[PDB]
Structure formats: structure tokens, C-alpha cells
Design a protein around this motif. Structure first.
Motif, PDB file in Angstrom:
ATOM      1  N   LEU A 168       0.887  -1.245  -0.014  1.00 15.17           N
ATOM      2  CA  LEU A 168      -0.104   0.006   0.008  1.00 15.17           C
ATOM      3  C   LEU A 168       0.857   1.444   0.091  1.00 15.17           C
ATOM      4  O   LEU A 168       0.460   2.169  -0.908  1.00 15.17           O
ATOM      5  CB  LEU A 168      -0.894   0.004   1.049  1.00 15.17           C
ATOM      6  N   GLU A 169       1.999   1.399   0.776  1.00 14.96           N
ATOM      7  CA  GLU A 169       2.927   2.475   0.590  1.00 14.96           C
ATOM      8  C   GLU A 169       3.464   2.531  -0.678  1.00 14.96           C
ATOM      9  O   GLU A 169       3.526   3.708  -1.220  1.00 14.96           O
ATOM     10  CB  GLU A 169       4.063   2.140   1.705  1.00 14.96           C
ATOM     11  N   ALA A 170       3.730   1.354  -1.376  1.00 15.97           N
ATOM     12  CA  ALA A 170       4.659   1.346  -2.743  1.00 15.97           C
ATOM     13  C   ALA A 170       3.346   1.914  -3.678  1.00 15.97           C
ATOM     14  O   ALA A 170       3.977   2.553  -4.632  1.00 15.97           O
ATOM     15  CB  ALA A 170       5.257   0.084  -2.979  1.00 15.97           C
ATOM     16  N   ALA A 171       2.151   1.445  -3.721  1.00 18.35           N
ATOM     17  CA  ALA A 171       1.019   1.872  -4.421  1.00 18.35           C
ATOM     18  C   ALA A 171       0.765   3.539  -4.414  1.00 18.35           C
ATOM     19  O   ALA A 171       0.209   3.940  -5.430  1.00 18.35           O
ATOM     20  CB  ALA A 171      -0.129   1.151  -3.916  1.00 18.35           C
ATOM     21  N   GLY A 172       1.069   4.063  -3.307  1.00 18.60           N
ATOM     22  CA  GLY A 172       0.976   5.550  -3.274  1.00 18.60           C
ATOM     23  C   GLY A 172       0.288   6.021  -2.024  1.00 18.60           C
ATOM     24  O   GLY A 172       0.318   7.171  -1.727  1.00 18.60           O
ATOM     25  N   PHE A 173      -0.515   5.065  -1.410  1.00 15.27           N
ATOM     26  CA  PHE A 173      -1.197   5.545  -0.037  1.00 15.27           C
ATOM     27  C   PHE A 173      -0.508   6.222   0.920  1.00 15.27           C
ATOM     28  O   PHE A 173       0.788   5.761   1.098  1.00 15.27           O
ATOM     29  CB  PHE A 173      -2.042   4.592   0.366  1.00 15.27           C
ATOM     30  N   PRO A 174      -0.759   7.662   1.306  1.00 12.48           N
ATOM     31  CA  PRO A 174       0.172   8.209   2.234  1.00 12.48           C
ATOM     32  C   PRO A 174       0.469   7.607   3.428  1.00 12.48           C
ATOM     33  O   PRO A 174      -0.354   6.797   4.002  1.00 12.48           O
ATOM     34  CB  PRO A 174      -0.657   9.575   2.455  1.00 12.48           C
ATOM     35  N   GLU A 175       1.416   7.816   4.041  1.00 11.84           N
ATOM     36  CA  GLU A 175       1.910   7.143   5.425  1.00 11.84           C
ATOM     37  C   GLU A 175       0.964   7.513   6.423  1.00 11.84           C
ATOM     38  O   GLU A 175       0.356   8.591   6.523  1.00 11.84           O
ATOM     39  CB  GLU A 175       3.280   7.909   5.882  1.00 11.84           C
ATOM     40  N   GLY A 176       0.492   6.549   7.197  1.00 13.87           N
ATOM     41  CA  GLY A 176      -0.569   6.778   8.228  1.00 13.87           C
ATOM     42  C   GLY A 176      -1.941   6.226   7.659  1.00 13.87           C
ATOM     43  O   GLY A 176      -2.872   6.184   8.760  1.00 13.87           O
ATOM     44  N   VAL A 177      -2.174   6.006   6.345  1.00 11.15           N
ATOM     45  CA  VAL A 177      -3.384   5.576   5.831  1.00 11.15           C
ATOM     46  C   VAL A 177      -3.649   4.247   6.036  1.00 11.15           C
ATOM     47  O   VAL A 177      -4.746   3.591   6.153  1.00 11.15           O
ATOM     48  CB  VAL A 177      -3.587   5.927   4.144  1.00 11.15           C
ATOM     49  N   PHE A 178      -2.716   3.375   6.038  1.00 11.48           N
ATOM     50  CA  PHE A 178      -2.782   1.981   6.257  1.00 11.48           C
ATOM     51  C   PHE A 178      -1.452   1.588   7.118  1.00 11.48           C
ATOM     52  O   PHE A 178      -0.392   1.577   6.577  1.00 11.48           O
ATOM     53  CB  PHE A 178      -2.904   1.009   5.002  1.00 11.48           C
ATOM     54  N   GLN A 179      -1.544   1.163   8.211  1.00 11.63           N
ATOM     55  CA  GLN A 179      -0.428   0.638   9.122  1.00 11.63           C
ATOM     56  C   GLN A 179      -0.762  -0.700   9.745  1.00 11.63           C
ATOM     57  O   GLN A 179      -1.810  -0.996  10.435  1.00 11.63           O
ATOM     58  CB  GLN A 179      -0.306   1.716  10.136  1.00 11.63           C
ATOM     59  N   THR A 180       0.134  -1.622   9.581  1.00 14.23           N
ATOM     60  CA  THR A 180       0.215  -2.873  10.265  1.00 14.23           C
ATOM     61  C   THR A 180       0.930  -2.566  11.745  1.00 14.23           C
ATOM     62  O   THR A 180       1.835  -1.888  11.893  1.00 14.23           O
ATOM     63  CB  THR A 180       1.229  -3.694   9.339  1.00 14.23           C
ATOM     64  N   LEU A 181       0.112  -3.187  12.581  1.00 13.74           N
ATOM     65  CA  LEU A 181       0.450  -3.304  14.263  1.00 13.74           C
ATOM     66  C   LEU A 181       1.032  -4.513  14.398  1.00 13.74           C
ATOM     67  O   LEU A 181      -0.010  -5.595  14.496  1.00 13.74           O
ATOM     68  CB  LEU A 181      -0.531  -2.822  15.107  1.00 13.74           C
ATOM     69  N   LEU A 182       2.134  -4.846  14.995  1.00 14.29           N
ATOM     70  CA  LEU A 182       2.762  -6.112  15.295  1.00 14.29           C
ATOM     71  C   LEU A 182       2.357  -5.952  16.775  1.00 14.29           C
ATOM     72  O   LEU A 182       3.387  -5.614  17.463  1.00 14.29           O
ATOM     73  CB  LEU A 182       4.121  -6.206  14.882  1.00 14.29           C
ATOM     74  N   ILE A 183       1.124  -6.631  17.243  1.00 13.81           N
ATOM     75  CA  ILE A 183       0.890  -6.502  18.502  1.00 13.81           C
ATOM     76  C   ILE A 183       0.384  -7.938  18.621  1.00 13.81           C
ATOM     77  O   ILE A 183      -0.200  -8.472  17.653  1.00 13.81           O
ATOM     78  CB  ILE A 183      -0.063  -5.444  18.851  1.00 13.81           C
TER      79      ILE A 183
END
Lengths: 452, 452
Positions: A168-183
Motif C-alpha cells: 500500500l505504501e509502494a502503491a502511493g497511499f500516504p503514510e498513516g493511511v494503512f498501518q500494520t500493528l505488530l501486537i
């Protein structure tokens, strides 16, 4: 949180869980990103989603390899999973704007309509079994609608979870728009309780789902739940038995049995049961069990040691009660979490297994005398996800469509999800619908507007 | 569970709560009734709903008297309420079948569609403030869709609760299709946890809604929540100020102020604020307070002693902090639960009252410099039910529609519910939509059907 390869039992990579403070900081970033992201045009979101589709389409084999390494599904079915992930991105890229266009209703008002606006930060809790598809099924419409998302994935597919965020980052969606949480599972409560998180989706199993929806409800936040099933596969005397046996074998054993819409309970009319079960037995016994990276493998290992222990106990207890093993029913003596294709028959009434989900290639087989009995047996479960019935009599087909207590009814085919049609459960399988129009309408504010 | 007349303070009738066994019996009867009722035609349901509409239209004055007696709203507004209850019966009578018709999607299937089937028993938890309308708003679509329902009404409107059930019985709905449960708040858990009850709706306040939605989520059951609001009423320089004053006075004072979509916070552009506030002050000052059965009465008593105590404390605390009383601000020195029309100004930033819902004819008033500031103040609450904005500038109109964080935005009019349009909150006001198409789609299994 770790990659442990189920084919080998080997620990490949360990990941550090986020601390509460780091979760907090990711939610702050999501909130800020949401303020900008809701003002993007549909055309920008469509381009970014199409970019993500193209990345999935170009690197299906690399992505599939990650899925197979972490959770053991055949490389070939993991390639198909990446292709279906690309498909749902394009579906919402193509339809999202029209699906969210104003809907006018004539009243005394000069203007009156419903418009559809994003809610804000969505939490998604996703399981290991379709580690790309389930995530994209949620993410494509959520992002097209203008929401931002935080993903808590299963702790045994951290590389898959990170790959989705990277795509999603490489696609162009800005930082913070989709984040994975390793929790971990225990940290989802923090997220749900944060004032900035506005709604949550969970795919997986009942205890995680009950926990999430309980906490969400307490916070006055909407949810969608897609949980397990014990789907019937009903075969009646007018069915194409050969196709039914072939498709039924696929429906039971796909994803190594680990699908919520697996054919779990085979319900066979008396007239055709002998031939059907004979053919099913032969089909199951011919399946290739081994290395999921090998293109001729049908059955890879189960995803975890716990998954293996679950089915082993479930099947042992049923047989102890007097269920008969027609085939399989014992784990393999080889390296990796391997359980064989299994057929149980003559399960005693009141056996505990009758109410359980078998998340492994284990078919329960039943014989019935008429349509009434088939419907009664099919629905005699806590779940109500999918159902499949096999008959070429119009009136039977209609009775099946009307009377099977499930979110999906397929006639003369196996239950499949498809972006063009809504998908979800009833009873203890959950509520809410992904895919189709419903999928993008789930996490929007349907704002009624009235102008004098 | 009692009728206590708020106009006099006297207990009129006390009612015995159902035991746990008696609740279980109602639910057994509902499940049995549901099995027959789901097989009824839409034509049958439409007749029964139109019969209910006719009963409401025939005896508006009698039903209105029950409402006024129990909870103190003016007899005239209760007459309006009973007419609105008939309106929604008629709306779903006339639209329910088309709204639930199969929806086809072209795929490779011979046939693929979504059909809409009823879930089963729905629990509704309803509030005293619109004791007929809120029940019928839920009941008409649920029944048209083939669900059955158990009602837990507010403890202080048992005669209204019993009357609603009686109407639906006389209309011809079969025994068990709609049952009133005379039970306390502490008994709702039993209903939610019963495996036969498949979904729940709550209209009311946050504590009760949080409890219900939490319990339902734990049980994997879908909910709809319609909770409180602190709706802004925003007046800008191009507004018809005189219509604004007249309409905002109604929006604040209707139902003796006890509406979730009352205008609670008046947000005035500085250019017009002195003129608007003077006229709002003059309006409130001459409102007629008195016996709610008198057709000349504007303001009856608040519903309950606790409702009176709540507003009294809220206002005193705001005044102790430095808020100015322009008008009213003290309970009246007479029998029954009378609080007068009140205006609070110069509320200190950070005052507690800024975040609370005032369920009483108490207007909070603010001045702002620009649209940016109006929007930020308007949204600076936990709630997000309705919002009203007054402007004849097309660009300002659009800004208000887009940026007000509410489930409804009315331009140059007060927020009103209408059977023709969906209605519900966002943020802490809840989730899901009643009315329009959305209303009948809430408590159905949207079943995907696929036929080879």
C-alpha cells in the motif's frame, strides 16, 4: 509474534511487539493522516488502488511464497489468493465512487439526500488462514471510502502483515493511511478503547470476535464479524454425483481444510450415499500430502502446532465415542504439522464434534431420508456461514435457498466469495457483509442531508 | 415499573415485573410465533400494518392522553406523535416488499442474487421520551421484514408499552409476533443472552446502550444504537434570522426539551448574534408553561424527578463556574417536575456542561467569528446525532453539509426524522440507521444465492 514454518516446525524470524506508547503514536499518525486522506478525490484513491492491484499481479509468486512459508497453504493456492486480492482492489477502484454517490429522495425539501462519508480510523483484526485476501477484502473498500486503517494481523503471519502495508505504501497511499500493528491479541483492547478509533472489523474465530465486539459495543462503536462455520454440503438423488464428489473434495480440503466456508458436513440422501461416499473416499485417499511449495501437492501442513492438537483431540474424542474412521484420522509421523484428509461416519447423536468447527481436512458424513431431514440436520449447528446443496429439481433448489440457515446458499456449486456479491454469516458465524455494495457501505457515515 | 404523573408527582399505577420464567415463556412463544410468521405473505403483513395505522389515526387523542399522563409531553405533540407512528406503519406497509425484493447481479451463475430474510426474535429497548414513535419506528420495518419482537420499554411508560402491543394485536398480528415485556433494566441481560434472541436495537442514553451493545457483541449479535446528542444550531449572517429564532425555539423546546435532536447549542456568527439572541430571549420568555393537557401549553413538566434533578444540578454547576443566566435557570415553585425555558450565555471554556446533553428546555449560546470556528465548536462534543445550519450562501451550505460531524445536517431547517429518509447518529450518538430503506435492511439476513 514470529514466523514458524509449519512444513518444518522451524522458527524463522522473531518480531518485537509494539509497546502501548508505540501503538499510541501510530494512532496519532493515523488521525493526522485521516484529516488529509478524507479530502483526497476518488480518482486519487482509484489510482492508488490500481497501483496496489498491479503490484499484487506482478509479484503473485513472491507474495504467495511468504504466505506458504508462514502458514503452510500450497504455493499454488497462495498465488490464487494474491490474484483474488488484486481483483478486489480493482473492484472497488472501479465501483467505489458510484457506490458512494449521493442518493436523492424526493421530499418537500429543495434538496434531500443521503451522502456517504468516512468514519475515521478503522481497526481490522485479521486471521492467518487467508492472510492477504481477508486483509484486502476489508482494505480495498475501507480506503476507497476515505477511511484509514490499522491492522492487527495474526501473530504467526507477521511477514504477510508487513508485506500488505509495504504494498500500500509502494502503491502511493500516504503514510498513516494503512498501518500494520505488530501486537498480540491482548493488545487489541488498547486500540478499541482509543477515542480516535471509530469502528472495528474482525475476521477469525468466536472468542476473539466476542471480545472485540463486546469492547466495541461498550465504546459505542460499530463492528463487523466474520467468524467460523460448519457448512453443510447436501447431495440429493438428482445431483451430478461425480461433480459433487470432485467439488466437495475441493471444498473440504482447500487451504488444508482451514476455511470458514469449507464443506465440513456432508449430508447425503440415502439413495446416493453409498456411491458418493465410496467415490469421496477414493478421491480423498489419492490427495498428495507434502511440501506446499511443490506444485503437485494438494495438502500442506496445518498452520500451527495448536491447530494440529485441536483437530487431533476433536477426532480422537469422536472415535472414542464410536464415530467410525473411514479414512485418515491420525496425524502423520513426519516433520511439520501434518494432518491427513479424514472421513468420519456413523457419528453418534449427541457427539460433541457435531457442534464443532473442524479446521483441518476432516469430512463428517451423514445419511438422510428426505428434504425435511436434510434441512433440519444442515441447520443443527451454532454457525451459519455457507451452505451448498446438490439437486436439479427446481422445487428442492428453492426449498434449499429458502430454508438453509446461512449467509450464502450455493446450488450445484461450492460456496465461494466473490467481490461482486456480498459475503457474511448469520447465527454464531457473525453479522455484517463484506464485498459488493454492502462492503463499502459498512464503515461510512450515511449522512442524511435536507436543504429547505 | 409505574405510572407516575409528572404534572402532579402522584403514583397512578404500579406494575409487577415478569419473573425470569415468565420472560423465558414469552421468548418460547416468540420463537414458535416466528416459525409461522416468517411464512406469512407481504400482503398479509401490509394489511396488519395498515390496520395498526388505522387504529392510531382513529384514536390519536386517547393514545396521546396516555403519553401525556405518563411522561408529561403536551397533548398536542403526543397527538402529532401518534400520527407520526401511523405514518411509519403506512410507509413500510407500502414499501416493505419492494425494499426486500431480490437484487440480481450478473456473474457466471445461471442465477445470482441477494435475498432478504428475517433473523428471528429482535429485542428492542426503548425510551420514555417518544414512547409511541420510537417503538413504531422500529416495529413497522421489523414486522414487515418477517421478524418478531420483544419490547423492553422504559419503566415509567408501562401503559404506553402495553398500548403498543394491544394495537398490534387488534390490528391482527398473531400472538407472539410483538410482545411487551414489563421488566427492569437489570433483566435485559437475560433477553440478550437467550439463544433464541438474534439481534437487538436500543434507543435511549449511553449507559444503557453501552451495556446492551457490549452484551450483544459478546453473544455475536448485531445491534443498532440511537443515543443522545448535543446538536448545534448554527446561525450565519445571510440567515432568515426571524425564521431561525422561531424554528430554533421549537427545536430546543419541543417535547419539553427532551429530544436527542433538540437544538442544544446555538452557534451565532458575531454579525448577527446580538439580534438573534435578543429575539431568542424574547421567544423563550413568553412560552406558556403549565398543564400539558391544555392545548395552549408550550412547556409541560420534565418526565421524571431524576430528569429534573439532573438539569438543576447541571445548570447550577455551570452558573457556579461563571456561566450567565439570561433567562430561567431555576426549577419552578409548583407541583410536578417543572423546569422553565432557560438560556445560558458566557459559558467558561472547559466548563463541564459544554460536553453534556441537556434534556430540558435549556439553550446554551455561543458567538463565533467565522465558519472555521463554527465548525470546530459545533463538532467539539462526544456526540454526533443531528446538526442545523442557517445560511443562504451556497458555499457555506456545502461546508456545513460536508464538515459538520453528524448523522444528519439540515440547512435552513430544524433536524426532523422522516420515514422517507434514514436516521441515526455517529460518534457517541450511536451507529446504524432506522427509516428509509436502511431501516428494513437492518435486521435481515442478506443471503447471497448462487445457482450454477
Amino acid at each position: 509474534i514470529a514466523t514458524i514454518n509449519p512444513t518444518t516446525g522451524e522458527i524463522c524470524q522473531r518480531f518485537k511487539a509494539l509497546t502501548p506508547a508505540e501503538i499510541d503514536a501510530k494512532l496519532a499518525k493515523a488521525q493526522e493522516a485521516f484529516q488529509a486522506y478524507r479530502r483526497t478525490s476518488f480518482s486519487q484513491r482509484r489510482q492508488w488502488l490500481e497501483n496496489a492491484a498491479a503490484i499484487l499481479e506482478r509479484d503473485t509468486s513472491k507474495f504467495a511464497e511468504i504466505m506458504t512459508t508462514e502458514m503452510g497453504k500450497t504455493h499454488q493456492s497462495a498465488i490464487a489468493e494474491a490474484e483474488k486480492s488484486a481483483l478486489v482492489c480493482r473492484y472497488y477502484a472501479e465501483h467505489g465512487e458510484q457506490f458512494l454517490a449521493n442518493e436523492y429522495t424526493e421530499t418537500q425539501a429543495t434538496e434531500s439526500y443521503v451522502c456517504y462519508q468516512p468514519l475515521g480510523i478503522l481497526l481490522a483484526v485479521m486471521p492467518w488462514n487467508f492472510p492477504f485476501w481477508q486483509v484486502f477484502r476489508f482494505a480495498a473498500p475501507a480506503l476507497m471510502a476515505g477511511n484509514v486503517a490499522v491492522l492487527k494481523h495474526a501473530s504467526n503471519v507477521p511477514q504477510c502483515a508487513l508485506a500488505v502495508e509495504a504494498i500500500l505504501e509502494a502503491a502511493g497511499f500516504p503514510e498513516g493511511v494503512f498501518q500494520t500493528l505488530l501486537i498480540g491479541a491482548s493488545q487489541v483492547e488498547q486500540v478499541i478503547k482509543d477515542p480516535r478509533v471509530k469502528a472495528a472489523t474482525l475476521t477469525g474465530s468466536e472468542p476473539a470476535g466476542a471480545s472485540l465486539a463486546s469492547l466495541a459495543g461498550q465504546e459505542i462503536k460499530p463492528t463487523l464479524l466474520e467468524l467460523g462455520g460448519s457448512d453443510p454440503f447436501v447431495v440429493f438423488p438428482s445431483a451430478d454425483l461425480d461433480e459433487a464428489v470432485e467439488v466437495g473434495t475441493v471444498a473440504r480440503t482447500m487451504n488444508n481444510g482451514q476455511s470458514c466456508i469449507a464443506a465440513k458436513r456432508f449430508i447425503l440422501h440415502e439413495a446416493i450415499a453409498a456411491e458418493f461416499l465410496e467415490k469421496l473416499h477414493l478421491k480423498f485417499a489419492s490427495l498428495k500430502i507434502g511440501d506446499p511449495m511443490a506444485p503437485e501437492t494438494d495438502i500442506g501442513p496445518l498452520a500451527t502446532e495448536g491447530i494440529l492438537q485441536d483437530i487431533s483431540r476433536q477426532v480422537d474424542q469422536a472415535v472414542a465415542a464410536g464415530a467410525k474412521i473411514l479414512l485418515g484420522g491420525r496425524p502423520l509421523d513426519r516433520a511439520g504439522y501434518f494432518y491427513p484428509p479424514t472421513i468420519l461416519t456413523e457419528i453418534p447423536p449427541g457427539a460433541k464434534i457435531l457442534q464443532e468447527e473442524l479446521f483441518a481436512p476432516v469430512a463428517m458424513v451423514f445419511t438422510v431420508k428426505d428434504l425435511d431431514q436434510a434441512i433440519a440436520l444442515a441447520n443443527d449447528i451454532p454457525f451459519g456461514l455457507g451452505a451448498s446443496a446438490w439437486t436439479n429439481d427446481p422445487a428442492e433448489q428453492q426449498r434449499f435457498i429458502q430454508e438453509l440457515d446461512a449467509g450464502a446458499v450455493f446450488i450445484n456449486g461450492m460456496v465461494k466469495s466473490d467481490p461482486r456479491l456480498p459475503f457474511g454469516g448469520t447465527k454464531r458465524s457473525g453479522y455484517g457483509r463484506e464485498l459488493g455494495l454492502a462492503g463499502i457501505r459498512t464503515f461510512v457515515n450515511a449522512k442524511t442531508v435536507w436543504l429547505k
